[PDB]
């Protein structure tokens, strides 16, 4: 039912406070399963989800080998970036990278991803054809010709089409009980009088997984986008997520308002209304 594995790398320089820190985390959809931190007492990749723990020591040491190598490569990227942007060695900078493969119900690659950002700004990204690059500026163009000359896209393509999807399929199998289980949101509408003429109707969605969800208020069948307050979906801490949408309505007219909830864990879109 469409899944993806993603790795997020962050490297940050800190002049006067040691070598640049490198942190890596891996996810399958909205479930983190691994982590690596160069700042840990004894840097080693650590499990963050139950199902991954059963992997053998070969997997874990290979992971640590890859991450230690990546740690040094990013320290070099930070040094190289100063040159590309004529920056001083006195400032702190950040390199971020995302890798990922999306797979369809049948397990075949829907698409691969590989993007870089320096100091929070898009730098270079592998195109969807997994064969070319898009550089954001003249420094990234340098990296592009450099990567084209070494045919980096081809090696990345192999990983994205091979190992990535193969391991994702394996993770989905081993973590089936959770990774392939959608938890529908528990929903209810609360009422909060704000004035004698107005009141707040808040539509809640709790304990749902995955994070993707749609909550909307309709006034007589019309969406109240511009007048709806929607908070960013937030993690509960138990793997599930939460979200709410609120609207201020004239006292007495609340029955003209309906809250609509769409989630993949629901047979069909829900419709709620305040029930006094």
């Amino acid at each position: 039912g469409s899944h993806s594995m993603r790795y997020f790398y962050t490297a940050m320089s800190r002049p006067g406070r040691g070598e640049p820190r490198f942190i890596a985390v891996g996810y399958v959809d909205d479930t983190q399963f691994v982590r690596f931190d160069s700042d840990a007492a004894s840097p080693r990749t650590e499990p963050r989800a139950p199902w991954i723990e059963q992997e053998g020591p070969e997997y874990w040491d290979r992971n640590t080998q890859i991450f230690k190598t990546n740690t040094q490569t990013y320290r070099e990227n930070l040094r190289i970036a100063l040159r590309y942007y004529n920056q001083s060695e006195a400032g702190s900078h950040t390199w971020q990278t995302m890798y990922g493969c999306d797979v369809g119900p049948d397990g075949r690659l829907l698409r691969g991803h590989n993007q870089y950002a320096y100091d929070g700004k898009d730098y270079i990204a592998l195109n969807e054809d997994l064969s070319s690059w898009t550089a954001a500026d003249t420094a990234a163009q340098i990296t592009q010709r450099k990567w084209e000359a070494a045919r980096e896209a081809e090696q990345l393509r192999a990983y994205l089409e091979g190992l990535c999807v193969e391991w994702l399929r394996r993770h989905l199998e081993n973590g089936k009980e959770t990774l392939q289980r959608a938890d529908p949101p528990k929903t209810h509408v609360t009422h909060h009088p704000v004035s004698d003429h107005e009141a707040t109707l808040r539509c809640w969605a709790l304990g749902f997984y995955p994070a993707e969800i749609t909550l909307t208020w309709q006034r007589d069948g019309e969406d109240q986008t511009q007048d709806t307050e929607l908070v960013e979906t937030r993690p509960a801490g138990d793997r599930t997520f939460q979200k709410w949408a609120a609207v201020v309505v004239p006292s007495g007219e609340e029955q003209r308002y309906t809250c609509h909830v769409q989630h993949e864990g629901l047979p069909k879109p829900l419709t709620l209304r305040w029930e006094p």
């Binding site: 790795y7 790398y9 890596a24 891996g26 691994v34 997997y59 290979r62 992971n63 890859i66 991450f67 190598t69 990546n70 490569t73 990013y74 070099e76 990227n77 190289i80 970036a81 590309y84 990278t97 890798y99 590989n114 870089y116 730098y123 270079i124 990296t143 450099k146 990567w147 070494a150 980096e152 990345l156 990983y159 190992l163 990535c164 391991w167």
Partner: peptide, 9 residues
Amino acid sequence: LPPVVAKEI
């Protein structure tokens, strides 16, 4: 397995 980033920018 995580992707190897052996090539610098």
